[PDB]
Design a protein around this ligand. Structure first.
Ligand SMILES: CC(C)CN(C[C@@H](O)[C@H](Cc1ccccc1)NC(=O)O[C@H]1CO[C@H]2OCC[C@H]21)S(=O)(=O)c1ccc(N)cc1
Lengths: 99, 99
């Protein structure tokens, strides 16, 4: 589809058998999701933006479905205020900026 | 143009007569630029990011050119890790997400 930017680009995603709302964020290098209890191994990581850094858990090869489009890659989990779909997965669903 | 997301969507902007690199950031409601001198009045404001809140100077009705496209709107200036172009300006240049 085509998503205008009048409002926040929030879409429904599916991860770990759960449905969530997430932001399609071209400004985010990597996907970061609100705290959740994913199974599997993970590695600690810190990501920075406006306001400083937060500590997150980096899971690899996580399957995410974004508006019916399937994607698999790195998913960070931590105390982010919003679920954020980053470029690492936006590329896998064929997402582009157009103006 | 059509911008893919394998790399950061960085573009050259023109503001206050100066050229700069900025990130097209669909996850940002507002436009936040690194420290710089801008003409015109400004009020103190606060914005929150993934890591907390920062102090910024709010400039209203600022002309800014993004890849040749002209926009006039609010520009926040403060200690952001990177110049980000938010939806308040992305809408003015007719920017959309497409997948
Ligand atoms: C600052 C950017 C270069 C990077 N950020 C993505 C960005 O889209 C955030 C993503 C974001 C969105 C909402 C809340 C927190 C973070 N938006 C943001 O900070 O916007 C602020 C300015 O306009 C306002 O609108 C939202 C917050 C304000 S980030 O959240 O810090 C981030 C950094 C690294 C990763 N892997 C994932 C996300």
């Amino acid at each position: 589809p085509q998503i205008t930017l009048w409002k926040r680009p929030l879409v429904t995603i599916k991860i770990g058998g759960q449905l969530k709302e997430a932001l399609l964020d071209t400004g985010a290098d990597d996907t970061v999701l609100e705290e959740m209890n994913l199974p599997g191994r993970w590695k600690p990581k810190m990501i920075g933006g406006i306001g400083g850094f937060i500590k997150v858990r980096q899971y690899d090869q996580i399957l995410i479905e974004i508006c019916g489009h399937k994607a698999i890659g790195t998913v960070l989990v931590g105390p982010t205020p919003v679920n954020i779909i980053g470029r690492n997965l936006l590329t896998q669903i064929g997402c582009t900026l157009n103006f």
